[PDB]
Design a binder for this molecule. Structure first.
Ligand SMILES: C[S@@+](CC[C@H](N)C(=O)[O-])C[C@H]1O[C@@H](n2cnc3c(N)ncnc32)[C@H](O)[C@@H]1O
Length: 255
């Protein structure tokens, strides 16, 4: 019976940047981004869409690494304003505040559509609608590259996990089911992989760095935000170990 700040509350966004690192508000920050993109091929003429672009870290990284044009879409105007402010000097990056479900792009626009821990905000029906849109928006041979939270079957959920999902308003499904949804939208070369052991390593590292810097955190943020972060990572670590909360990797191609 308490009022909990929502995930992207003013303080929540700042706290996520503290734990994930500057410009990022999802798993593994720049470290995971480097790894996820380590076999991805793009150049200065490539066009990339980032679905759920947040504070802009991913767009910044992709443009810096490849020189690619990057277009980030995020439903949160406040984040889009931040991303724009921080990347004014990058002419080939643009950000737009919109619900991706209300976006259209022409057929064959993007060499890559990229999304990191954002599609969890969408209902199953909306995920399907989005993947149908993504299929259209990709160029021939274009790549869809996603990480997203996934979960064990609902009957294996316990009380705390259910409370977490409700609070966050997430819609989480198992990895195979997510891959099958992508396949059903005609994507080919579909890879749907459980990378929860790598997620575990990132969670452990993130928490260890938070605890190391507790005094630093407490100079600017609340001890309630501190314990909320700490307890939240503690639960994610526990729940990934028993295969309840999962991290999914999905790569697919339009052929
Ligand atoms: C966990 S954050 C990750 C952001 C960024 N990809 C990152 O890794 O730092 C998920 C993002 O999804 C965005 N989002 C949620 N629903 C959306 C929608 N319908 N359209 C576009 N973005 C959405 C949120 O505003 C949030 O910034």
């Amino acid at each position: 019976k308490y009022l909990e700040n929502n995930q992207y509350s003013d303080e929540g966004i700042k706290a996520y940047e503290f734990i994930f690192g500057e410009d990022y508000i999802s798993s593994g920050g720049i470290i995971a981004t480097t790894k996820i993109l380590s076999d991805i091929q793009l150049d200065a003429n490539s066009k990339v869409l980032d679905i759920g672009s947040g504070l802009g870290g991913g767009c910044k990284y992709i443009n810096e690494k490849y020189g690619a044009h990057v277009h980030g879409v995020d439903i949160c105007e406040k984040m889009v304003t931040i991303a724009k402010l921080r990347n004014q000097d990058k002419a080939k990056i643009e950000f737009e505040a919109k619900d991706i479900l209300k976006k259209d792009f022409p057929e064959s626009t993007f060499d890559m559509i990229y999304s990191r821990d954002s599609i969890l905000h969408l209902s199953y029906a909306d995920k399907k609608m989005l993947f149908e849109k993504c299929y259209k928006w990709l160029k021939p041979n274009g790549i869809l590259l996603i990480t997203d939270y996934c979960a064990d079957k609902i009957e294996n959920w316990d009380e705390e996990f259910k409370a977490y999902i409700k609070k966050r308003k997430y819609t989480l499904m198992p990895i195979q089911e997510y891959g099958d949804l992508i396949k059903s939208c005609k994507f080919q070369n579909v890879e749907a992989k459980d990378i929860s052991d790598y997620w575990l390593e990132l969670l452990q590292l993130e928490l260890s760095k938070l605890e190391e810097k507790k005094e630093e955190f407490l100079k600017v943020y609340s001890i309630k935000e501190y314990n909320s972060l700490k307890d939240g990572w503690t639960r994610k670590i526990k729940d990934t170990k028993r295969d309840l909360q999962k991290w999914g990797y999905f790569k697919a191609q339009k052929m």
